[PDB]
Amino acid sequence: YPQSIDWRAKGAVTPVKNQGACGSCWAFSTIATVEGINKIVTGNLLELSEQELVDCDKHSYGCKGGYQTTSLQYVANNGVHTSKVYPYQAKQYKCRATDKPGPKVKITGYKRVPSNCETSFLGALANQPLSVLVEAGGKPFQLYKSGVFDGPCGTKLDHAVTAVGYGTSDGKNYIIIKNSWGPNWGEKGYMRLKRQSGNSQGTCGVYKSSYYPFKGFA
Amino acid sequence: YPQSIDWRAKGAVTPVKNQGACGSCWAFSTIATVEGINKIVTGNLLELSEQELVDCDKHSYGCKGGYQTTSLQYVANNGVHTSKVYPYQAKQYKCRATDKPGPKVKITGYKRVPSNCETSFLGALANQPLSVLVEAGGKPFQLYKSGVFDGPCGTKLDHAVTAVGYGTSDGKNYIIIKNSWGPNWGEKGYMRLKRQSGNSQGTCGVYKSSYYPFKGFA
């Protein structure tokens, strides 16, 4: 893999969104990875529907939390509609996927990045954005404004975000994270998270639970 | 269905191509329908590879003829590459589909339009372009320049073309056919073929063997 990569610069990342007061982070993270792989495979960057996952992934809890695996499986099985067609409401309603037009973007399946390992993480991120989990509940994380964040934070995973690149700055290796708290949080909605080397759980548990979808066709 | 329809006007038809001195009409017809459904489903008009079918559909005979069913099945199973990536050579070579990048457009499957019936034909053409067979070997068909062609021609099917619309002109109902003989033949590469009413084999056997692909995902 290269010394650095930024999928935003490669046109595989849509603008920062805001989950509002709804615990739909799991949906946002899954959608960002799907938007990314769709662009990488087809060349087109489409904004996909987090709302469809919120309403339709029956294995998740809408605004009360959900899972990376079940939401990615949902897209692999059913495809996902565009957000234009199924816009975000920050609330869970009845699944309305069927009454929807436009295309349904589908993925073939998803894989798990071998955990707690910087090398595996970078090797996979060099190919496409990853859905990752982090402990974001601590005060420092919440109030992050800029720079390479290195805590303090533990590994009590409670938030799903999207890794969209990595690199180094001022003698510090980092990972670019796209959060779903709007453009006012952090560095225009992103955070450069310190990259722990080798075999470790990662800063705020970033290497513990990473997944990526794979898409073989258009 | 409407009184008339023209998929060219709806942006679902790529420019007229020329099979050259290669009996790859079957590949051209299949590709035109796939290009059409892809646009209808995804909104993007991509030019797909006839060459991939020529080289890769092992059930067909390259430049010596082939089938509507086997070529459509090929795309349903393997998807098809863009022509940019796998350009036409008017000759059959080794299948080179695997060493190719870019996306592979796939279809879910294909269906047969109930034969010898104007109503079924129009009902299906109102939804998307159709792969149809016609007897094009006769002198009149070969030398067609303009107007609503109504023969003479029999029903000895020997050529595959694409139906891309229908309508009426000067008291005559017709079907718009996209041929693969270049832009100099007929009406800029197209032919308005007389539409026989009801239960009949159609002018030049146009209602005898029509198929269309269906695509459920992007």
Rounded CA separation A43/A56 (Å): 27
Q: In chain B, what are the domain boundaries?
A: 1-218
Q: Does B44 reach chain A within 8 Å, measured CB to CB?
A: yes
Q: B78 to chain A: nearest residue by CA?
A: A217
- Pair of tokens at residue A39: 């662009």
- Residue A123: which region, alpha, beta or left (left: phi > 0; alpha: psi -120 to 50)? alpha
Largest Cα–Cα separation, chain A: 52
The C-alpha of B176 sits at a distance from chain A's nearest C-alpha, in angstroms, of 27
Q: Out of 3.90.70.10, 3.30.70.920, 3.40.630.10, 3.60.15.10, select the CATH number for domain A1-218.
A: 3.90.70.10
Q: What is the resolution of this structure in A?
A: 1.7
SS3 labels along chain B: CCCCEECCCCCCCCCCCECCCCECHHHHHHHHHHHHHHHHHHCCCCCECHHHHHHHCCCCCCCECCCHHHHHHHHHHHCECECCCCCCCCCCCCCCCCCCCCCCECCCEEEECCCCCHHHHHHHHCCCCEEEEECCCCHHHHCCCCCEECCCCCCCCCEEEEEEEEEEECCEEEEEEECCECCCCCECCEEEEECCCCCCCCHHHCCCCCEEEECCCC
Rounded CA separation B81/B48 (Å): 6
Instruction: Report, as residue numbers or ranges, the catalytic residues of B.
Output: 25, 159, 179
Q: Do A106 and B42 touch (CB under 8 A)?
A: no
- Verify whether residue A159 is a known catalytic residue: yes
Sign of CA dihedral A55, A57, A61, A66: negative
Q: Does B40 reach chain A within 8 Å, measured CB to CB?
A: no
Rounded CA separation B76/B65 (Å): 20
Q: How was this structure determined?
A: X-ray
The C-alpha of B30 sits at a distance from chain A's nearest C-alpha, in angstroms, of 17
B44 vs A contacts (CB less than 8 Å): 44
Catalytic residue of the set A25, A117, A153, A204: A25
Rounded CA separation A45/A75 (Å): 17
Q: B79 to chain A: nearest residue by CA?
A: A217
Answer yes or no: are the C-beta atoms of B213 and B75 closer than 8 Å.
yes
Beta-carbon contacts of A58 under 8 Å, excluding residues fewer than 6 positions away, are A95
Classify each residue of B3-25 as buried b or exposed e, where b means 16 or more C-beta atoms within 10 Å of its C-beta: ebbebbeeebbbebbbbeebbbb
Rounded CA separation A54/A94 (Å): 9
End-to-end Cα spacing for chain A: 26
Rounded CA separation B44/B37 (Å): 10
Sign of CA dihedral A156, A161, A167, A172: negative
Q: Which residue, B7, B1, B16, B55, is CA-closest to B184? A: B16
B43 vs A contacts (CB less than 8 Å): 102-103
Rounded CA separation B92/B60 (Å): 11
Rounded CA separation B174/B105 (Å): 31
Helix (H, G, I), strand (E, B) or coil at A179: coil
SS3 labels along B138-194: CHHHHCCCCCEECCCCCCCCCEEEEEEEEEEECCEEEEEEECCECCCCCECCEEEEE
Residue whose token pair is 């059959």: B92
In this structure, which amino acid lies at residue B162? T
- Pair of tokens at residue A208: 């513990």
Helix (H, G, I), strand (E, B) or coil at A123: helix
